[PDB]
Design a protein around this nucleic acid. Structure first.
Lengths: 85, 49, 1111
DNA sequence: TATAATGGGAGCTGTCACGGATGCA
DNA sequence: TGCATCCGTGAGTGCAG
């Protein structure tokens, strides 16, 4: 599924956040914080480690993602090439 | 009407004859891939891709 | 000063609440203020009632509630949150087999809330939801463009709530039907409804023309459920026609009031159209085993009687404003809501038949996310959710009253022809005919008329007084377009004694055509002229002397009025300048009678007669969406005694409660040595002196510091290789001190990121080896200031994580924002405009000793050029000056009502009275006529402006009343050979200032795949040299200049680098090689399996890749 | 790794005009 | 054979975005 493939067991635990965060929200009347997740997630789970878990759950975005409501611009054009000198 | 489409068709034969292309070549076995840099994967400011 | 009114038109009702179309609408969809028991099945409610209950186990809907927001309006603006309320919905699961009862109130997400003025806050930026215009639900007939005597009939529901259907009666006698563009004989369908051969002639029975052609018994030889399967084959080429699947497909298209909804509108329109009551908003019913038609035969009844000639069967005008209608904001979002709800229902039933059919609650059968997302969508990427226009307060109000034909549900730009855009007859007093944009959106985006309102069905209606006998009642009624057309309606200003129609010819419309008619024949009368135009258009004084195509520019151009730090209401007003400051909800008023307790640049506290001590705090120097300082200033003093509804602070661009879009200036209308050329404008340096046309502006400059796969970014005051002078304004941490001056190049926030795998290479590891400093491991990534920006740091916001209240997007440590300000004097390049469409750039600022001036020493402020007026045809600005002349010397402002204002005599009266002050002051103060005033008077006589043989005073009097005065050139003292028009004008500073648009690049960013320069001032762009520019150079034959453009200036990476080295080395630039973007063109044709090949004259290839792609 | 489970699901609508290739009295 | 009829292709510039 993902443009960046991730080990199946890492996917496995990602959805485990998605699901337990969702119930937290369904009990809270608001979305949980990083901390309120590491608690309901249990032991070996701190606020730091739910964060860096999300920041790899992060799906990339299209270079042709359309800019404006006409379409004569592409989100990739506003991106400077910093490799080439 | 027969004379007409044997022209249309024949045009395509000589198109191949004159050039040296093989008709079969309009069917790829090996699809090519375009260099990565021309279709990049980039980290934008937020470390996102 | 005195405020003299004109106008004979006693307007009966006032302007209605000018944001009601935004606020009334959303609230009639939320009902967050109604006890659920007392709610009514429209809006957020009706969507629940529609999707529920879910079916085989069953899950049914009890009621919803809404909680107050977790953060107040302003807190969300800062913290880039949304101003939204938590949505709870109580449910009860019940088992399709046993009698299970569980009941939780599951949380569905946050519904965003609309503020007091009509706006929204969405990740902390105000936004507007532009009501959308669309063809309305109902059934219509419109002649066939092919067969001049046969007429398509069409059947249209609300958008995406059912299919369109046409009933074109073919050239083979029997009547057709189109669904998903799949034509077939109508008959087959009537059968399925339980219809019998006889009961067709028993209902048609008149038009043996086709009534007898409609019937073809290759169909009649079947029972109802027999053709039921007949047609499932006609629309599903492949699906097994089981009598469980066909009743489901048809129903799921034509009788299922769950994906087929005519409007609530659609019901009434098709009802009165075909004159039949309609059980529900649905074409067919399923009742007592089979299908019972509701709409097909009535429609079939009309169409036939029309194609013969029956009376009362007219084609319909789909551009009438009875057949068009408005999807207000509330309706627009419940649409998106009714699509989130239906997605959640794909998510319950899925878990209703897999996972455990008895240990289940509502709580865990509902995934709130399909709902949460469709709402996040509507407000964050709709065509109809636009960044608010809070340039000045008029811009926000005009926005909320916009009407787009475009958007999801309406018209794609290409779908827009002529009829959509034309001003229709029935626009009269509903949609403004002026206020619309020039350009490609002309006639799609428009504005709500000022007296107009949208009824509960989504149609626009406008008010009218009822006349009986010939006397005019104070009883007003608002008509839809359709009923209007029933009456003869007298004109706003048809003249009256008391309240009887006093003329014998009255000027009236009958279905929008103008008719001259006696007061016996007159049924209704326009409320006012203000009722035919936009709000903005009603801000144009002397509108009836202004060709339409510039009224429009003076209309739009107002919403671009930068708010000026000394703003003033126009000397000549139209009467709305006060409501607008009111409903704009930007000024600040008195809730009840009382006395004023304290007063301060920061707050205004008032004791009331109720003893309550309210404390209105002042929104002071708030940055608007468009950068324009949204500043609230106080207008009372301690102990002031305030009756109700009086004022307590002026909003921005409001003076004592009047819409102050610009300044009033002394204007001379005369060519001035070339600086008038083509609408350019010359101004008196005396304007910047007294701080006229000055404005304050702000830009946010934001930066993040994020956790990296190479270290953390650090907000430090410790930037490598940087001199203390280059930090003398930064605090310990790396923030500029609040109150510094910052200019281009200056650090605003120091920052350090870690270097890469290019950590010092040899070339560099050696250069440091000589200097005693070794390679440093961090990097200057400081946020500097952009070219051509800057000002005075007014605030800073520093949000880390690890601090309370705060948590930012993953992997980001800390985010620092520094707001900068500038006081913008007027300068050479900025745009000025007046309410009549005179627009121009400040081309020159003379010092006061050069300005034309009057005999009594006074210099003018603006020299406009008369060449603007003739071909432009906007004469109002001419009158607006003349009555400005008078006002200037009497010390008066005026209120000239649109179309019912001050006329030429009334105003030449006022000029006489001014002349007395300007000259009689003189011939007493010890001075007579002046020698140059005669030489001019000599000329005026050759012209014919003055009667020869009259005392100079007599003649100067005569010139004055023509609004003309003697003017001495300040460069010579000699008089202008002629008498000039000089007066007082209202002139705004527009938003388009040179400061925001000067830009230039030598070399900068390039694009990933093309290596051509980026585009746009903010990226530090390059200028796009397009196909059309290339042509230009081509036609000149500048091969080398063009080639340059196409290689060394764009993407010939080799010769580009080679050039800039050549300049800094003082050498001529080098002949170029192949542009890089052409290489991409080669490689991209290989990826399509095409073998492109550069070749030399002897036909052998040529490697434009210098061997780097051969093996 | 083992009750049994055996053919989907959303269509989307108001432009236009020309040229070429295909079907049909 | 002549002529419906469908399918695919176009539909202005740059700048803000």
């Amino acid at each position: 599924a993902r443009t960046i493939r991730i080990p199946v067991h890492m996917v496995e635990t990602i959805n485990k956040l998605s699901r337990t965060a969702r119930q937290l929200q369904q009990e809270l009347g608001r979305e949980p914080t990083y901390e309120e997740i590491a608690e309901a997630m249990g032991p070996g789970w701190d606020a730091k480690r739910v964060e860096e878990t999300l920041k790899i759950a992060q799906e990339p975005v299209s270079l042709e993602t359309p800019i404006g409501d006409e379409k004569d611009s592409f989100y990739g054009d506003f991106i400077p090439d910093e490799h080439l000198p | 009407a027969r004379r007409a489409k044997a022209r249309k068709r024949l045009e395509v034969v000589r198109a191949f004859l004159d050039s040296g292309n093989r008709p079969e070549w309009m069917i790829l076995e090996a699809v090519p891939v375009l260099p990565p840099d021309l279709r990049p994967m980039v980290q934008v400011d937020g470390g996102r891709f | 000063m005195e405020i003299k009114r004109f106008g004979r038109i006693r307007e009966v009702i006032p302007l209605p609440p000018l944001t009601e179309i935004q606020v009334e609408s959303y609230r009639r969809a939320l009902q967050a203020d109604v006890p659920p028991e007392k709610r009514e099945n429209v809006g957020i409610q009706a969507a629940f009632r529609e999707t529920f209950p879910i079916e085989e186990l069953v899950l049914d809907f009890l009621e919803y509630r809404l909680g107050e927001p977790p953060f107040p309006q302003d807190e969300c603006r800062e913290k880039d949150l949304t101003y939204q309320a938590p949505l709870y919905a109580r449910l009860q699961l019940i088992h399709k087999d046993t009698g299970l009862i569980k009941e939780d109130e599951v949380f569905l997400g946050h519904i965003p809330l609309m503020t007091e003025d009509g706006s929204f806050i969405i990740n902390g930026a105000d936004r507007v939801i532009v009501s959308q215009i669309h063809r309305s639900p109902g059934v219509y007939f419109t002649p066939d463009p092919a067969r001049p005597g046969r007429y398509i009939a069409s059947i249209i529901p609300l958008p995406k709530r059912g299919p369109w259907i046409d009933l074109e009666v073919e050239p083979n006698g029997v009547v057709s039907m189109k669904v998903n563009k799949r034509k077939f004989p109508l008959v087959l369908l009537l059968r399925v409804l339980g219809y019998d051969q006889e009961t067709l002639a028993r209902e048609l029975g008149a038009y043996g023309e086709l009534v007898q052609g409609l019937m073809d018994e290759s169909v009649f030889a079947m029972r109802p459920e027999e053709a039921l399967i007949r047609l499932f084959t006609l629309l599903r080429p492949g699906d097994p026609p089981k009598r469980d699947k066909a009743v489901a497909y048809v129903y799921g298209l034509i009788a299922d009031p769950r994906r087929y909804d005519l409007g609530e509108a659609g019901r009434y329109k098709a009802e009165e159209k075909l004159g039949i009551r309609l059980s529900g908003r649905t074409l067919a019913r399923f009742e007592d085993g089979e299908f019972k038609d509701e709409v097909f035969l009535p429609t079939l009844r009309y169409l036939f009687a029309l194609t013969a000639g029956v009376p009362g069967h007219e084609v319909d005008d789909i551009d009438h404003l009875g057949n068009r209608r408005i999807r207000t904001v509330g309706e627009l979002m419940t649409d998106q809501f009714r699509v989130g709800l239906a997605r959640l229902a794909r998510g319950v039933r899925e878990r209703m038949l897999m996972g455990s059919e008895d240990s289940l609650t509502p709580a865990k059968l509902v995934n709130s996310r399909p709902l949460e997302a469709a709402i996040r969508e509507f407000f964050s990427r709709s065509q109809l959710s636009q960044f608010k226009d809070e340039t000045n307060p008029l811009s926000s109000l005009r926005h909320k009253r916009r009407i787009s034909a475009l958007g999801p549900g309406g018209l794609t730009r290409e779908r827009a022809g002529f009829d959509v855009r034309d001003v229709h007859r029935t626009h009269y007093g509903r949609i403004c005919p002026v206020e619309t944009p020039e350009g490609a959106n002309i006639g799609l985006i428009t504005s709500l008329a000022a007296y107009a309102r949208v009824d509960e069905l989504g149609f626009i209606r406008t008010p009218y007084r009822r006349v009986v006998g010939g006397v005019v009642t104070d009883e007003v009624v608002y008509m839809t377009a359709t009923e209007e057309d029933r009456y003869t309606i007298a004109q706003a200003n048809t003249p009256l004694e008391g309240n009887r129609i006093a003329a014998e010819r009255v000027v009236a419309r009958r279905k929008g055509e103008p008719v001259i008619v006696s007061p016996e024949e007159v049924e209704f009368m326009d409320v006012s002229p203000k009722q035919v135009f936009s709000v903005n258009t009603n801000l144009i004084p002397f509108l009836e002397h202004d060709d339409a195509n510039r009224a429009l520019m003076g209309s739009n151009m107002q919403t671009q009025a930068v708010p000026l730090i000394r703003a003033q209401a126009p000397v000549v007003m139209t009467g709305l300048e006060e409501r607008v400051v009111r409903d704009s909800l930007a000024a600040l008023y008195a809730e009840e009678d009382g006395e004023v307790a304290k007063v301060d640049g920061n707050r205004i506290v008032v004791r009331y007669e109720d003893g309550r001590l309210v404390e209105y705090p002042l929104r002071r120097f708030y940055r608007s969406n468009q950068g324009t300082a949204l500043d609230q200033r106080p207008r009372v003093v301690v102990g002031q005694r305030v009756r109700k509804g009086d004022l307590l602070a002026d909003g921005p661009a409001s003076e004592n409660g009047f819409l102050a879009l610009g300044q009033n200036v002394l204007v001379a209308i005369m060519p001035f040595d070339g600086y008038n050329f083509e609408d350019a404008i010359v101004i008196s340096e005396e304007l910047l002196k007294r701080d006229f046309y000055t404005s304050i502006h702000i830009e946010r400059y934001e930066i993040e510091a994020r956790d990296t796969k190479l270290g953390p970014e650090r907000i430090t005051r410790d930037i490598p290789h940087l001199s203390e002078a280059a930090l003398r304004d930064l605090d310990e941490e790396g923030v500029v001190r609040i109150g510094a001056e910052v200019k281009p190049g200056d650090i605003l926030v120091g920052r350090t990121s870690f270097k890469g795998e290019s950590e010092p290479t040899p070339e560099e590891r050696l250069l440091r080896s000589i200097f005693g400093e070794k390679a440093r491991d961090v990097k200057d990534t400081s946020l500097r200031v952009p070219p051509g920006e800057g000002g005075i740091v007014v605030r800073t916001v520093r949000l880390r994580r690890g601090d309370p209240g705060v948590e930012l997007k993953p992997g980001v440590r800390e985010v620092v924002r520094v707001y900068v300000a500038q006081k913008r004097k007027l300068q050479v390049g900025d745009k000025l405009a007046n309410r009549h469409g005179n627009k121009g750039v400040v081309a020159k600022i003379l010092p006061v000793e050069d300005m034309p001036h009057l005999p009594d020493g006074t210099p003018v402020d603006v020299i406009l050029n008369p060449l603007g007026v003739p071909s432009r045809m906007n004469l109002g600005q001419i009158l607006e000056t003349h009555l400005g002349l008078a006002g200037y010397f009497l010390g008066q402002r005026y209120i000239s009502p649109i179309f019912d204002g001050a006329k030429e005599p009334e105003i030449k009266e006022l000029l006489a009275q001014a002349f007395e002050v300007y000259f009689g002051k003189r011939k007493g103060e010890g001075f007579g006529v002046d020698k140059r005033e005669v030489e001019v008077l000599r000329r005026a006589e050759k012209l014919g402006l003055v009667t020869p043989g009259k005392t100079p005073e007599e003649q100067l009097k005569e010139l004055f009343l023509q609004g003309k005065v003697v003017l001495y050139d300040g460069r010579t003292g000699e008089p202008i050979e002629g008498p000039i028009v000089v007066g007082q004008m209202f002139i705004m500073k527009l938003y388009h200032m040179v400061e925001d648009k000067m830009h230039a690049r030598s070399t900068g960013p390039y694009s990933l795949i093309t290596q051509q320069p980026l585009g746009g001032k903010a990226q530090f762009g390059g200028q796009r040299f397009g196909e059309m520019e290339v042509w230009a150079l081509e036609a000149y034959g500048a091969a080398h200049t063009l080639q340059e453009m196409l290689t060394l200036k764009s993407d010939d990476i080799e010769g580009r680098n080679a050039a800039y080295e050549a300049i800094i080395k003082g050498e001529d630039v080098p002949e170029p090689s192949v542009p890089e973007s052409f290489r991409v063109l080669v490689k991209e044709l290989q990826a399509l399996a095409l073998d492109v090949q550069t070749l030399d004259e002897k036909d052998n290839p040529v490697d434009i890749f210098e061997g780097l792609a051969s093996k």
